[PDB]
Amino acid sequence: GMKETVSNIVTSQAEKGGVKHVYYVACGGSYAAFYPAKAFLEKEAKALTVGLYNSGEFINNPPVALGENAVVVVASHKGNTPETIKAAEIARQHGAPVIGLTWIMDSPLVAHCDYVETYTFGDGKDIAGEKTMKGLLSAVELLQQTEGYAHYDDFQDGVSKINRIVWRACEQVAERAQAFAQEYKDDKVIYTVASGAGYGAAYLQSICIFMEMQWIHSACIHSGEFFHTPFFFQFSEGNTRAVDERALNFLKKYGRRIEVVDAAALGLSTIKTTVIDYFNHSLFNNVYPVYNRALAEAR
Amino acid sequence: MGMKETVSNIVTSQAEKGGVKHVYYVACGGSYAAFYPAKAFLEKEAKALTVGLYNSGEFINNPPVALGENAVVVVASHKGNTPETIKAAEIARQHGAPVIGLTWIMDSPLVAHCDYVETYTFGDGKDIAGEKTMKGLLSAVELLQQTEGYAHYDDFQDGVSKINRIVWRACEQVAERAQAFAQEYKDDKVIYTVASGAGYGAAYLQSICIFMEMQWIHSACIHSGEFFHGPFEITDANTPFFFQFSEGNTRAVDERALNFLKKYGRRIEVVDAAALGLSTIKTTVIDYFNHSLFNNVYPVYNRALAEAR
């Protein structure tokens, strides 16, 4: 478990000055999957630092605080990406404990980590166990076991709820997804829009899905960026909902074509407002496939 | 010298309160990516100091819990009237965090909500040594030097003394190529920028600003790290790339990406810091000068591209 893994780390490093620095390092889909974890530590930590790196950049330009007071968390689906493996090696060379997240438990990556955690994956998976959620649980536990986390139980409550929310949401959007697919099957460019701890899910939707999967041009616009062609709009619940609302109003005043995917309409608010931020990504990242499958099958 | 003094006042003021432990850079728009080098600087170089970089909207709606008496907030607003950025300054001040404001305008409403104000050079013929990005960086270098010490302080200052001349010469130097670029690309509906490292924000600005809102050409900014491995899925055949070839610790990342794109025969406009005279700056600090180079060279390319229509 993450709890136990972190316990072992906090123990192993206590005599070395403790855990002061957290680095999430991955490529591609796995990089975006750690954005909620970075957002969590940035919002919630008073002592711990957090950094999120592309694996290439990390191995070519490691931080000076990489050492015995750093924990490095690496992710690679197949446990094969050479740059992420090299990140783990470089971490261990500096005396930093390495947690690997992988689906393939005897991949090359496992050989260069101190701890390995796996996640649920594919159709039918339980969301409470998915990669993003393991990344978040690493952050939650690293916080809780170093400085304390005031909303630990609220977070675990959220973990116990998110699977049911997502399965229901996927059912709920299934009709709209059909219409969306009709209305957008000829578009060569679709923007995504998001903010806050869920931003990474919209970034994945642009890059991994529209561009790399469907040869549709895309960019992901932060909601705050409009002040200073259709839009696939991520309307979050929690502390940046007001940022998103302002952006949506703006877009509608230009009569843009906008597909709105609203966390509040999809039942996310059974999660307590103390932690709801951190569950936007898991909602959107597991709801978008309904829209994407429909889009692809209209083309 | 002014930024050294400001930070000196803050270090003194926060000393009997536990010291400065957290630095936040907050802005909208063009000011925001302008602080990416400062973020990259503290992330690479600091052992104790945390750094965060925020859009003002997100800062005011979701402020970090560490915002308090051991935090410093640097806000930037050009005319000093971004309501969100004024509100960011006010929220910090309410939390007991010293605020440094960056503006071109000493009279602006922003000045009334900052503990300290620094101005910066602006417009054509400006001293790059004094530009917004550079003041952001100097806040970071002084905050680090005056708290933990900074091993490359003098090298950093050397860089500051050279950057203005490097940038003006590079602007003259690319004038011819910029013409050719303009002709080559005048008919294009999509240009991607590519970059890595502490200069990435300049490539982000180049996409989202210049391209996507000066020629209304679809653009996006892609990190060099995306082009390490096949398959080549991201774009179709004819989509071209405006490629920021950095000097410093991520040059190798960029070199890999560049070779990947050439291997697949892509249309690439290369702007190379190494070929524009940045390499007089010591390698200990050269990462931090990429932004100021590219952000001040791109105008030449962009003016010619807009004219070629």
Domain positions in chain B: 2-150, 162-307
Please enumerate, by residue number, every residue of A annotated as part of a binding site for Mg(2+): 225, 228
Task: Please answer yes or no on whether A240 and B43 come within 8 Å at the CB atom.
Answer: no
Assigned CATH class of B162-307 = alpha beta
**Record: contact A46-B29, CB cut-off 8 A:** no
Comparing A2-150 with A161-296, is the CATH topology the same? yes
Query: DSSP letter at A209?
Result: I
Cα–Cα distance for residue pair B139/B2, rounded to 1 Å: 10
Q: Please give the sequence-ordered ranges of beta strands (E in DSSP) within B56-133, or none if there are none.
A: 71-76, 99-103, 116-119
CA distance A158 to A107: 31
B61 to A239: CB separation less than 8 angstroms, yes or no: yes
- Phi (first) and psi of residue A13, to 5 degrees: -105, -5
Q: What is the DSSP letter of B49?
A: -
Q: How far apart are CA B35 and CA A21, in angstroms?
A: 22
Report the gap between the CA of A171 and the closest CA in chain B (Å).
Answer: 30
**Cα–Cα dist A237/A255, whole Å:** 24
Collapsed DSSP state (helix, strand, coil) of residue B107: coil
Which residues of chain A does B225 touch, with a Cβ-Cβ cutoff of 8 Å? 27, 54-57, 83
d(CA B227, CA A142): 32
Listed residue (B268, B305, B298, B228) closest to B33, CA to CA: B298
Spatial distance between the Cα atoms of B291 and B197, rounded to a whole number of angstroms = 10
Q: Residue B199: exposed, middle, or buried by beta-carbon count in 10 A (0-12, 13-18, 19+)?
A: buried
Chain B contacts of A207, Cβ < 8 Å?
234
3 state DSSP class of B102? strand
B69 exposed, middle or buried (CB, 10 Å; 0-12, 13-18, 19+)? middle
- The answer, for B229 touching chain A at a CB cutoff of 8 Å, is yes
Note whether B196 and B225 are within 8 A (CB).
Answer: yes
For domain A2-150, give the CATH number: 3.40.50.10490
Rounded CA-CA distance A204/A209 in Å is 7
Query: For residue B212, which of A220, A248, A199, A136 has the smallest C-alpha distance?
Result: A220
Residues 6+ apart with CB under 8 A from B5: none
Distances (CA, A) of A163 to A75, B69, B272: 22, 40, 48
Determination method here? X-ray
Contact B121, B25 (CB under 8 A): no
- Structure-block tokens of residue A213: 């999967």
How many Å lie between the alpha carbon of B229 and the closest alpha carbon of chain A? 9
Q: Which among A219, A74, A218, A89 is positioned nearest to A134, based on CA atoms? A: A74
C-alpha span between A159 and A133 (Å, rounded): 8
Angle at which helices B153-173 and B132-145 cross, to 10°? 170
In three-state secondary structure terms, B114 is coil
CA distances from A166 to A136, A237, A255, A285, B280 (A): 17, 14, 30, 10, 55
User: Resolution of this PDB entry, in A?
Assistant: 1.8
Separation CA B23–CA B68 (nearest Å): 11
* Residues β-bridged to residue B131: B121
Amino acid at A105: M
Q: Do A43 and B62 touch (CB under 8 A)?
A: yes
Q: Where are the beta strands (DSSP E) in chain B?
A: 22-27, 50-55, 71-76, 99-103, 116-119, 192-195, 221-223, 241-245, 268-272
What is the spatial distance between Cα A193 and Cα A88, in angstroms, rounded to a whole number? 33
Contact status of B29 with chain A (Cβ, < 8 Å): yes
A129 interfacial to chain B (CB closer than 8 Å) = no
Edge-to-edge, what's the strand order for the sheet holding A258-262? A220-222, A191-194, A231-235, A258-262
Q: Token pair for residue A112? A: 């260069």
Q: Which residues, numbered 48 to 107 in chain A, qualify as contacts with chain B under a Cβ-Cβ cut-off of 8 Å?
A: 49, 51, 54-57, 60-61, 63-65, 81, 83
For tokens 């999120």, the residue is A52
Write phi, then psi, for A124 (nearest 5 degrees).
85, 5
CA atoms within 13 A on the CB side of B290: 34
The answer, for B223 touching chain A at a CB cutoff of 8 Å, is: yes
CB A283 within 8 A of CB A169: yes
What the block records as the tokens of B244 is 């920021």
B38 phi, psi to nearest 5 deg:
-60, -45
Q: At what angle do helices A35-44 and A280-296 cross, to 10 degrees?
A: 160
The contacts of residue A275 (CB under 8 Å, 6+ apart) are: A151, A154, A155, A157, A158
CATH of A161-296, one of 3.40.50.620, 3.40.50.10490, 3.40.470.10, 3.40.225.10: 3.40.50.10490
Please tell me the distance in Å from B150's CA to the nearest CA on chain A.
11
Annotation-wise, does B231 bind a ligand?
A: yes
Q: Does A156 touch chain B (CB under 8 A)?
A: no
